[PDB]
Design a binder for this molecule. Structure first.
Ligand SMILES: CC(C)(COP(=O)(O)OP(=O)(O)OC[C@H]1O[C@@H](n2cnc3c(N)ncnc32)[C@H](O)[C@@H]1OP(=O)(O)O)[C@@H](O)C(=O)NCCC(=O)NCCSCC(=O)NCCCNCCCCNCCCN
Ligand SMILES: CC(C)(COP(=O)(O)OP(=O)(O)OC[C@H]1O[C@@H](n2cnc3c(N)ncnc32)[C@H](O)[C@@H]1OP(=O)(O)O)[C@@H](O)C(=O)NCCC(=O)NCCSCC(=O)NCCCNCCCCNCCCN
Lengths: 169, 169
């Protein structure tokens, strides 16, 4: 199992979208990926980066059925807390099926931790679906706290439609 | 009741920390604000901004007991979604007790909505405590969805200590 975890470059954006679309097809809710390869380039590889990705890369031998070298990714960005400052936020990660079980996910997790030490982050935040007890227990074994269950936080969103109203109300 | 909502400047950071400490004093959970005025400056007014603040400013007429012109704030940043791209994230906002009830809060909400259109955000995410039924209903009346209730999302945290292990193991 030879792989490397490295930062994404602009040349990796096609691979990241491909994997985002495989993640979308994977996860149970049925939202569609509106995001384009150009969006990914603009938003991550333009001026101010709105996300950062780590990428899992394999050598020619282990390339996919369609000739791809990228088999996994993590997406993260930096957030802020008024009590304790800068935080690392983990948005998602995914490893392709035939490449699971070889320490990629774990190795991805290691490199995120290094991002958080480097960048002086006090915590790493992320969402886990309540129904996903294997992933919950996984993260608790690693020292995670469930802040929804401890402090009662619920995630809300106001959609573009209603923000339009409010921007003019 | 005259007031203006405006972007924060470096000269506002002392007021922001003060209001943050008043917010902490308000919150029911008891956590020490570890952030300094210097943190706020480096993190918000250095090279890369990790947060953005909107500030409520009153004329000399209604300045505070200790002689301050800043009577409320909002803290926000930009986050990312692999399906749909850039989002506006509302971290917190707070208005001083003697200045509540004059439209500042709603006017802050209004200006955040403008930020979301100017930066091309598809929605605005924030957290609400499940116990806070007045806030929940307030936000619903404005078209907010509860994504924890609908999709089962829970907020997780792995804090500095365990990230330390993972980054070195
Ligand atoms: C789980 C994997 C990532 C694991 O990677 P690898 O196979 O390389 O792992 P290792 O070889 O190191 O294995 C080590 C062992 O530990 C367990 N192991 C290792 N890692 C794990 C994890 N992570 N979980 C459970 N078990 C693990 C694993 O089961 C092993 O155990 P063994 O018994 O030894 O075999 C992968 O299988 C994969 O990609 N799976 C598909 C995705 C998935 O199911 N879960 C991803 C949850 S992480 C996601 C996360 O943290 N935040 C994202 C949520 C945020 N969303 C918000 C939605 C909002 C946006 N949306 C809007 C649009 C609407 N639509
Ligand atoms: C609520 C106010 C902001 C209101 O602003 P104003 O007074 O200017 O309001 P208006 O004059 O415009 O409008 C008046 C009417 O609208 C209602 N009106 C207006 N707004 C509201 C709201 N929001 N709710 C209810 N009613 C409202 C209000 O009840 C009135 O009603 P009438 O019947 O018309 O008279 C203010 O009172 C205030 O700052 N209060 C203190 C803070 C507070 O209680 N809530 C803030 C919730 S927003 C927070 C938010 O979105 N995410 C924060 C969660 C993130 N946490 C993550 C944890 C991370 C930190 N981890 C460290 C460890 C912690 N230890």
């Amino acid at each position: 199992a030879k792989f490397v975890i490295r930062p994404a470059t602009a040349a990796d954006c096609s691979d990241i979208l491909r994997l985002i679309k495989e993640l979308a097809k994977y996860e149970y809710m049925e939202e569609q990926v509106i995001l384009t390869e150009k969006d990914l380039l603009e938003d991550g590889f333009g001026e101010h980066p709105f996300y950062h990705c780590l990428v899992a890369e394999v050598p020619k031998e282990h390339w996919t059925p369609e000739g791809h070298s990228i088999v996994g990714f993590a997406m993260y960005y930096f957030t802020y807390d008024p009590w304790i400052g800068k935080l690392l936020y983990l948005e998602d990660f995914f490893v392709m099926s035939d490449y699971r079980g070889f320490g990629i996910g774990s190795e991805i997790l290691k490199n995120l931790s290094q991002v958080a030490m480097r960048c002086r982050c006090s915590s790493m935040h992320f969402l886990v679906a309540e129904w996903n007890e294997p992933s919950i227990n996984f993260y608790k074994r690693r020292g995670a706290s469930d802040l929804s269950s401890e402090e009662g936080w619920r995630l809300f969103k106001i959609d573009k439609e209603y923000l339009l109203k409010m921007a003019t109300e």
